[PDB]
Every structure is written in structure tokens, then in C-alpha cells.
């Protein structure tokens, strides 16, 4: 009978998270609940990682000359308009964690899943994962450099 590409269960992926990456995911989830959104999204995670200057996501934006305020406003205006019970992760966020773990465990040479790999996978498939506002903000970030020099570019990170 017909099968699709293998999917890893969410709790196995969450267990790969670096301890600080995981703490920020827990913050993203609380944020979602506080806002009464229906799904935890990559935007909620970004929103919280932006508050730590040594997150991988901050370190990438600093290197790209991007301002925290512009990314915050793009996120504020694309949050779900629905108000809701515990949310689920969005199916796009589950699938994103699985691609970012596959990249981490292979090309990035990372023992743990970090927000930098999650961000790199979303940027590498930005048509799939990024809203039009984020695409346009992040258009100039060099994915190949970030992939090839991941560990050095993000050497200052709290997620190491």
C-alpha cells in the first residue's frame, strides 16, 4: 500500500534540541497560549529568539545587517487572526524541525538541534516556510555561507 516519505514523531525531534533552544521553544509555546493562537508557529519561536542577543537567530541577523524591530513588526502583522484548549504545533513547524534536524546531523555537523539550523532550513526553503514579509526581509542572507560555516558564524551563540 502507498506510503509517503518517512515522518519523525515530534517528541523525538524535540528531544534533539539544545537546552537553550528548547527553553526558547517553551517560551514560544507560552507566547502562543498568552495570545490564544490556534498553532505554535515558527513565528512564535522567532519572536522569542529575537529577545536573546546571543540566539543563533540574532547572530545571523546581526551578520546580515538586519534590525530586530523590522523582523518583530513583520511577525506581529502575520500572526493568526483566529483566537481559541492547548494549541498544536503547526504542521509546517513539525516538518521544519525534521528538515533542520536532518541538516544538523549531516551537513552542519551538529550534535544538537539549534535555532540556527531551524532558521537555515526555513531560509533554504523559504517558499515553503516563510511569509512574503519575511522572504523579502531575508532575501539577501547567504544560505550557502551559513550552511558551510555554520559553527564558526554562530560561535558566540548561547545554543552551542
Amino acid at each position: 500500500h502507498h506510503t509517503d516519505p518517512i515522518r519523525i514523531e515530534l517528541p523525538t525531534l524535540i528531544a534533539k534540541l539544545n537546552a537553550q533552544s528548547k527553553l526558547a521553544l517553551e517560551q514560544a509555546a507560552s507566547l502562543c497560549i498568552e495570545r490564544q493562537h490556534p498553532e505554535v508557529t515558527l513565528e512564535h519561536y522567532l519572536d522569542v529568539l529575537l529577545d536573546n542577543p546571543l540566539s543563533d537567530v540574532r547572530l545571523v541577523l546581526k551578520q546580515a545587517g538586519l534590525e530586530v524591530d523590522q523582523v518583530k513588526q513583520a511577525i506581529a502583522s502575520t500572526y493568526s487572526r483566529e483566537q481559541v484548549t492547548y494549541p498544536a504545533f503547526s504542521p509546517l513547524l513539525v516538518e521544519l524541525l525534521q528538515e533542520a534536524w536532518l541538516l544538523s546531523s549531516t551537513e552542519l555537523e551538529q550534535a544538537e538541534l539549534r535555532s540556527g539550523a531551524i532558521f537555515l532550513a526555513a531560509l533554504t526553503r523559504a517558499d515553503r516556510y516563510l511569509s512574503f514579509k519575511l522572504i523579502s526581509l531575508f532575501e539577501g542572507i547567504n544560505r550557502e555561507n551559513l550552511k558551510k560555516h555554520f559553527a564558526m558564524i554562530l560561535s558566540d551563540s548561547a545554543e552551542t
Partner: peptide
């Protein structure tokens, strides 16, 4: 007992 992320993960399966 179940954490926030535990509850959210269960909802994700369901």
C-alpha cells in the same frame, strides 16, 4: 504533571 510542551505535543499528535 505533563508540561506545557507535553500538552502541545499531544495535541499535535491528535
Amino acid at each position: 504533571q505533563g508540561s506545557l510542551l507535553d500538552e502541545i505535543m499531544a495535541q499535535t499528535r491528535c
